């Protein structure tokens, strides 16, 4: 019931222009509608690829919805001037007059949030975007922002994009309550923990095999290792894999599939409120594999219990949902 959005992060990085176009064709041919990219993804090659797929983005004669973000990393801030530069560039790349969703990618702890939101309003007034979004803000920062917008009559954020998966559930305690209260819908990223929950890695690979992927041989490799590559995580994947063979046997699904099905059927996400899962992939064979799992049904209760047991294993060493 929960929506599916296309994660365009690896477009320009692991997937070339052709592979990315193929993936977008596949995604849309399953009736899905929305795509997530960002100013910063693959040095801007992501937004430029999508902008050149002739999707007439931002138009009225247009079925596809597009999402982008502005960050306060590198030279950039979320101060008014930088904020504009980043969006205006995203637009020129995407070859469109406006985006459907515009996120603040992360908190800019050096810029008062008031200044940023006023600037967001002024940009909304100019029709550069439809909906405002937040990502990686703490629950309480969201509460502040929404209250400031109500009282200053600025556009309220209506979508939160956050780190959520079967073995990473910090968002549940405070963020979700908060989001439901202020009426934001939640879009999940890292739904496979970068691929860790596909079960294709073993802990001992950090010392030896080091397979070129999300966790090895790129700029952000180490960050992702500090996030998800813990011993207790690999215990938890094993625990689920054993529970899968036990309850399903020979007919057992891949735990790529199991992990995605957890998000769609057994998480706190709710189709009713417009929540979505942002799917990640580095290849077409992976997307087809994942889109299938999206449509698959719910899991036996004994497996959902095992996921829960695995989460309890790692909860103490869980990464923060906020920067």
Ligand X SMILES: NC(=O)C1=CN([C@@H]2O[C@H](COP(=O)(O)OP(=O)(O)OC[C@H]3O[C@@H](n4cnc5c(N)ncnc54)[C@H](OP(=O)(O)O)[C@@H]3O)[C@@H](O)[C@H]2O)C=CC1
Choice from 142, 260, 281, 306 touching a copy of itself (CB under 8 A): 142
Residue 41 falls in the annotated catalytic set: yes
Does 242 bind a copy of itself (CB under 8 A)? Our answer is no
CB 256 within 8 A of CB 280: no
Segment lying near a copy of itself (by CB under 8 A), choices 5-13, 40-48, 173-181, 252-260: 173-181
Does 312 bind a copy of itself (CB under 8 A)? Our answer is yes
Interactions with ligand X, residue window 188-207 (CB under 6 A) = 189-195, 198, 200
CB 185 within 8 A of CB 160: yes
Q: Which is nearer to a copy of itself, 84 or 121 (CB)?
A: 121
Beta bridge partners of 187: 161, 276
Residue 190 in marked binding region: yes
Catalytic residue among 41, 103, 164, 187, which?
A: 41
CB of 132 to a copy of itself, least distance (A): 18
**What are φ and ψ of residue 133, in 5° steps?**
-135, 160
Q: Site map for ligand X, 209-238, x if CB under 6 A?
A: ----xx------------------------
**What are φ and ψ of residue 279, in 5° steps?**
-85, 140
CB 255 within 8 A of CB 197: yes
Q: Which is nearer to ligand X, 33 or 282 (CB)?
A: 282
What's the token pair of residue 186? 């939640």
CB of 215 to a copy of itself, least distance (A): 24
User: Residue 48 touches which of a copy of itself, ligand X, none (CB < 5 to 8 A by kind)?
Assistant: none
Could you give the 3-state DSSP secondary structure of residue 76? Answer: coil
CB 99 within 8 A of CB 129: yes
Does 66 bind ligand X (CB under 6 A)? Our answer is no
Compute the residue count for the chain: 323
Residue 41 in marked binding region: yes
Nearest CA to 276 among 190, 187, 162, 161? Answer: 187
């Amino acid at each position: 019931r929960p929506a599916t959005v296309l994660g365009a992060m690896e477009m320009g990085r692991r997937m070339d222009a052709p592979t990315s176009a193929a993936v977008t064709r596949a995604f849309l041919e399953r009736g899905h509608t929305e795509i997530d990219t960002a100013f910063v993804y693959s040095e801007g090659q992501s937004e430029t690829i999508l902008g050149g797929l002739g999707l007439r983005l931002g138009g009225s004669d247009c079925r596809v919805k597009i999402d982008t973000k502005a960050i306060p990393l590198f030279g950039n801030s979320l101060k008014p001037d930088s904020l504009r530069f980043q969006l205006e560039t995203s637009l020129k790349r995407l070859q469109c007059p406006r985006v459907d969703l515009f996120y603040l990618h992360m908190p800019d702890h050096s810029t008062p949030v008031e200044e940023t939101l006023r600037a967001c309003h002024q940009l909304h007034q100019e029709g550069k975007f439809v909906e405002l979004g937040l990502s990686n803000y703490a629950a309480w920062e969201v509460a502040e922002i929404c209250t400031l917008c109500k009282s200053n009559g600025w556009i309220l954020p209506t979508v939160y994009q956050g780190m959520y998966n079967a073995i990473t559930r910090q968002v549940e305690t405070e963020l979700f309550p908060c989001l439901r209260h202020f009426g934001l819908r939640f879009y999940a990223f890292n739904p496979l923990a970068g691929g860790l929950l596909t079960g294709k890695y073993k802990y001992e690979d950090k010392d030896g095999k080091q397979p070129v992927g999300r966790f090895f041989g790129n700029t952000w490799a180490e960050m992702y290792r500090n996030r998800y590559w813990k011993e207790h995580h690999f215990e938890g994947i094993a625990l689920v894999e054993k529970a899968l063979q036990a309850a399903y046997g020979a007919s057992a699904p891949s735990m790529t599939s199991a992990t995605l099905r957890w998000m769609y059927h057994h998480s706190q996400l709710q189709g009713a409120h417009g929540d979505a899962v942002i799917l990640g992939m580095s290849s077409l064979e992976q997307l087809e594999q994942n889109l299938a799992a999206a449509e698959e049904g719910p899991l036996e209760p004994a497996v959902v219990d095992a996921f829960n047991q695995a989460w309890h294993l790692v909860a103490h060493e869980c990464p923060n949902y906020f920067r």
